[PDB]
Design an enzyme around this catalytic site. Structure first.
Site, PDB file in Angstrom:
ATOM      1  N   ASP A  51      38.919  39.422  36.649  1.00  0.00           N
ATOM      2  CA  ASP A  51      39.496  38.637  37.730  1.00  0.00           C
ATOM      3  C   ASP A  51      40.448  39.463  38.583  1.00  0.00           C
ATOM      4  O   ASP A  51      40.473  39.329  39.808  1.00  0.00           O
ATOM      5  CB  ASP A  51      40.202  37.403  37.160  1.00  0.00           C
ATOM      6  CG  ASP A  51      39.222  36.351  36.661  1.00  0.00           C
ATOM      7  OD1 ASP A  51      39.654  35.415  35.959  1.00  0.00           O
ATOM      8  OD2 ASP A  51      38.016  36.449  36.979  1.00  0.00           O
ATOM      9  N   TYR A  82      38.014  28.971  36.989  1.00  0.00           N
ATOM     10  CA  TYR A  82      39.317  29.195  36.354  1.00  0.00           C
ATOM     11  C   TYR A  82      40.513  29.057  37.282  1.00  0.00           C
ATOM     12  O   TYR A  82      40.422  29.297  38.484  1.00  0.00           O
ATOM     13  CB  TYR A  82      39.425  30.608  35.698  1.00  0.00           C
ATOM     14  CG  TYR A  82      38.199  31.200  34.993  1.00  0.00           C
ATOM     15  CD1 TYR A  82      37.810  30.740  33.572  1.00  0.00           C
ATOM     16  CD2 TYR A  82      37.426  32.171  35.636  1.00  0.00           C
ATOM     17  CE1 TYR A  82      36.568  31.408  32.981  1.00  0.00           C
ATOM     18  CE2 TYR A  82      36.295  32.752  35.038  1.00  0.00           C
ATOM     19  CZ  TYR A  82      35.876  32.367  33.728  1.00  0.00           C
ATOM     20  OH  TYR A  82      34.768  32.929  33.137  1.00  0.00           O
TER      21      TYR A  82
END
Ligand SMILES: [Cu+2]
Ligand SMILES: [Cu+2]
Lengths: 620, 620
Positions: free
Chosen positions: B290, B374
């Protein structure tokens, strides 16, 4: 009404009357412990029968006794004389603390030791410390306390800054005799003061802290009925209080839809020991079972609003017995309130365009106790998402000694010539489980790494395994942080909508357990502290991991003895005993008063619900 | 004035011009990354030369470039063409999250795969997932993205509830062509919806939550100057922001008496990877960096008052560059505030009669980001007692798959036929240390048990040992929770009043590290994640544990390469890289939207001060 209500002053006074009428509480008698007993399993009893258990000491030297009385019926259920040399001495009496210093003040040996150090006896404070069990045969069957000296230069001086090393005395608090006085040599008594309220040490106080105001315009979200029954955001429980264990949580349950689902029948800190790791003869016998020997509840502080508990607080003022059976109230001894706990759930979805954010909150039930130099805060938390957590906060003033000239491998230096012996603070949480009822089982869950090859060609796969603990003999477990080991308590007869047994997962902090050599006295007396988790079959008389009488009691009782029964725990009424603690190597930052350090554990639902239990929480 | 101030819209605009007036910026180019460089070691060079680093992509197919521009003098410090096949591809572009679905929409293989499942192509969402590196020589050197499908029944529907398993596609986002489409078979697409704002699923919203009001009638205790310089309760630091790392803390120092003492020069989360443990070929290549591949900072959410950040909040709105060099502001992307943190220190002394209690507080600096399904909250905390802590809060919607008939050892069932592949969330905190200055060293501290015998006759003694890490070759350490292992960063040339080197102790949570097989591709590309602590010698070009270009990079980059230099770290300018993460076995409770779970670490002073640094805190 509720059989789980707090003891009232009237009930305590009635117990006193029952004992007196029974001829069990004459003028030479003293109550060393008194507590209400939980109702027996199965509500078969037509009505409620409030029973109290009492430990009766005799100041004349007669054998003490364990007595159970029914205040409801005004009867003595049972009364047995105790052989302390065998089963253990009763808890230390608050009235015996001052005795140690008082007796030593006129002892020739003690006076000579003080004179050798040019110390004025009028300024020498003596800490009344539990004796434990060692090589002194004459102590068997007698109530002994050991004393360590600290100089107090004036009324408001912090004596802990001035330990008198190389000296220790043993005293029989019943016969009022000094049995031994050991002087291994003079040590310089640390001169620097540790008065944290003295401007000379604190310097000008900070004026930079602006106020933080926490209030609830519409009052708290929880309701209290029956004096101690709490209902908050689907949770249901009864807040009890025991002089030995302190705050005890009863009938922890969660309202899921139209049904009240039990989770934990009884939760408490059943024991807490503070073993010291300094091999000096002056302190090598030092092990304080704050719960078992001193009874932490007895010394609970009265919590000041805005100081100890901030926000909209609801207080409980538990009543306990004094040494004569008279009721004594601990004003505002328990704080209850709910506090914001940041974000609960959040998601900003690109595809749907919906941005969702919800806040968390937790119900807090706590108390704070003081035992000599230590002060401990016991906190229980209930979260919106079903999580249950316990947190211990350790503060106070560190126990001191002299710092040896050539350094030390077991003591750290806090100030010039001032040392702090290494030690641990280890707790035992007794969790009488009731996951969706009493039919429970425990599984140890480990992460499982997989080898790259057929079926896992890219070597990315990882799994987990669960091992059911079927008999008590295989239920003494140790932590394994490296493999993410946890323990799941489930109900094999209650399944969620996905056909899986409902459960809760215990997440430990995986801190070091008891460090003492396995052959030590403390390793045997505090056997529970050597392993992270124990599971036993429930039994009415198995209340503490160390047994009923810990004071000057050798091994022979507690968890090791209970486990020997090797009872079936696979889908039965079971109890989980979790050991967790702090290993303290004092820092200079801990002196003159130590900032709070914490340790605990928590349990999170694991397939207990059919989906998130907080979807009904509003945006507000 | 400060060289550490946040980037302004103006500076970004200038960078854009420079690139333009250099033929480096054009209609075929795209800014994949842009950020300000920190001042060089040595402020001896008066006047700060504000420099920015840029990664330029080319939609045409031309080689990308890394360019360093000087906004201060409006010039191009350097410009180098990059060979992606060698050093890795540039971070995924936000504008590329569309292409995957758009391209597959007109591909016969994909359409045939959907028709076989009777799915309306107009309702099929496709997640743009990083590709990694797996036996596909054809992809080497090419900018590839893999796509997994999810069905969205309507515009506000949560597509995550309807994963289309047994299907995966690989696409080239530059040449715009579907390199491949894999269909291992048809899996039922879970039918249940997961719309957490739908009354039928949430049920009646509870009306039991009374408000909690947090206010500061006199404002916050912290001051903000120079736009991002914070001063709070003796703490001093600069709050920076990077599109890749997110919130970065600079010059963390503590005002001890009359001197500002540095502690940490730079603190950030340098990488965050999400490796999946499902061996299915449909997801076995799944690993999301990420931070490194997507750049968490660019997706930071705008935090709403009273919703995301409660109390008296001071916001920072960082500015970043869009794909064309235009400045874009992230309104209220960073929250700053102080919150009460219970009891700080407490002691009721019997001998002195003094009852003392002080409250604790923490300064909070945070932001929240969203990457596909997320949502992560990054929180940095500064405590009154000197403790520094980081906490990551993971929430959002779990990444789904079909739940295999017959169960799975690598996937959890959340709803009928709905699965959630096992995975981890592993962070790397890069701590450029400056304990009382740059001359630092790291020691590994283990508790040491002692054997009963001579010098320890009662078997109660325990100690500790410290091992100095002298060379990088011996600075790759593992956790050992059983022995209470911690790491101390000290300054051998700066001693406290007790003649001991000042230091700070890092306390890890000791959660499991990377689980993948040692020979897996992820173990090589995310080598940092296989060990808990790394210590390297500072170097201006060693910023991330995974290297500068993580996307589709063969591996070995970052820490493994840096450590290979085997440089001296004993009393030198060093950097600590701590790996910590969550191992997630999704629970039913995590569906349809997951409750926050947390992980982090903290550093506490260890002989840094000469006594408690909070003796001057008032009773308030
Ligand atoms: Cu301690
Ligand atoms: Cu996860």
């Amino acid at each position: 009404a509720s059989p789980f209500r707090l003891a009232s002053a009237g009930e305590i006074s009635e117990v006193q009357g029952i004992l007196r009428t029974a001829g069990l509480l004459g003028p030479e008698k003293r109550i060393a412990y008194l507590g209400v007993l939980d109702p027996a399993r199965g509500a078969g009893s037509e009505a409620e029968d409030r029973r109290f258990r009492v430990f009766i000491h005799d100041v004349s030297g007669a054998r003490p006794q364990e007595v159970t009385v029914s205040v409801t019926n005004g009867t003595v259920i049972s009364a047995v004389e105790l052989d302390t040399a065998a089963t253990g001495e009763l808890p230390v009496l608050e009235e015996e603390f001052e005795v140690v210093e008082q007796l030593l003040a006129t002892d020739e040996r003690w006076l000579k030791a003080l004179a050798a150090r040019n110390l004025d006896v009028s300024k020498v404070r003596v800490a009344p410390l539990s004796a434990g069990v060692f090589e002194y045969a004459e102590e068997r069957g007698r109530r002994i306390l050991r004393g360590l000296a600290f100089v107090q230069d004036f009324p408001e001086d912090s004596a802990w800054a001035h330990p008198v090393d190389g000296l220790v005395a043993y005293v029989d608090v019943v016969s009022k005799e000094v049995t031994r006085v050991i002087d291994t040599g003079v040590f310089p008594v640390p001169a620097e003061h540790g008065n944290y309220t003295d401007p000379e040490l604190t310097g000008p106080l900070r004026t930079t802290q602006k106020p933080i105001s926490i209030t609830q315009p519409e009052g708290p979200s929880f309701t209290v009925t029956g004096g101690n029954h709490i209902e908050w955001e689907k949770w249901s429980l009864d807040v009890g209080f025991d002089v030995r264990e302190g705050v005890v949580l009863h009938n922890i349950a969660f309202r899921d839809g139209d049904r009240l689902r039990p989770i934990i029948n009884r939760a408490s800190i059943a024991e807490m020991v503070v073993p010291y790791g300094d091999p000096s003869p002056i302190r090598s016998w030092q092990n304080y079972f704050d719960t078992g020997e001193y009874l932490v509840g007895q010394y609970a502080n009265s919590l000041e609003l805005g100081c100890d508990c901030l926000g909209d607080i609801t207080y409980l003022s538990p009543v306990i017995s004094d040494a004569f059976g008279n009721p004594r109230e601990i004003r505002n001894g328990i704080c209850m309130h709910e506090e914001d706990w940041g974000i609960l759930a959040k998601h900003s979805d690109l595809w749907s365009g919906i941005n969702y954010t919800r806040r968390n909150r937790r119900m807090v039930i706590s108390f704070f106790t003081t035992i000599g130099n230590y002060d401990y805060g016991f906190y229980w938390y209930l979260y919106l998402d079903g999580t249950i957590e316990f947190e211990a906060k350790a503060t106070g003033v560190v126990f001191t000694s002299a710092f040896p000239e050539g350094g030390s491998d077991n003591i750290s230096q806090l100030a010039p010539g001032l040392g702090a012996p290494f030690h641990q603070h280890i707790f035992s949480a007794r969790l009488d489980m009731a996951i969706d009822g009493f039919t429970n089982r425990v599984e140890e869950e480990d992460v499982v790494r997989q080898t790259m090859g057929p079926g896992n060609e890219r070597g990315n796969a990882f799994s987990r395994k669960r091992t059911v603990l079927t008999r008590e003999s295989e239920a003494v477990r140790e932590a394994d942080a490296r493999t993410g080991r946890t323990w799941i308590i489930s109900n094999p007869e209650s399944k969620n909508r996905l056909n899986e047994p409902v459960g809760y997962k215990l997440h430990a902090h995986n801190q070091p357990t008891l460090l003492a050599d396995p052959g030590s006295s403390i390793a045997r007396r505090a056997a529970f502290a050597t392993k992270d988790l124990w599971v036993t079959r429930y039994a009415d008389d198995e209340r503490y991991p160390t047994g009923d009488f810990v004071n000057q009691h050798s091994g022979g009782a507690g968890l090791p003895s209970y486990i020997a029964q090797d009872r079936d725990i696979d889908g039965q009424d079971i109890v989980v005993w979790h050991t967790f603690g702090l290993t303290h190597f004092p820092r200079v930052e801990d002196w003159p008063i130590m900032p709070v350090d914490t340790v605990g554990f928590k349990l999170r639902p694991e397939g207990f619900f059919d989906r998130s239990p907080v979807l009904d929480v509003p945006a507000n």
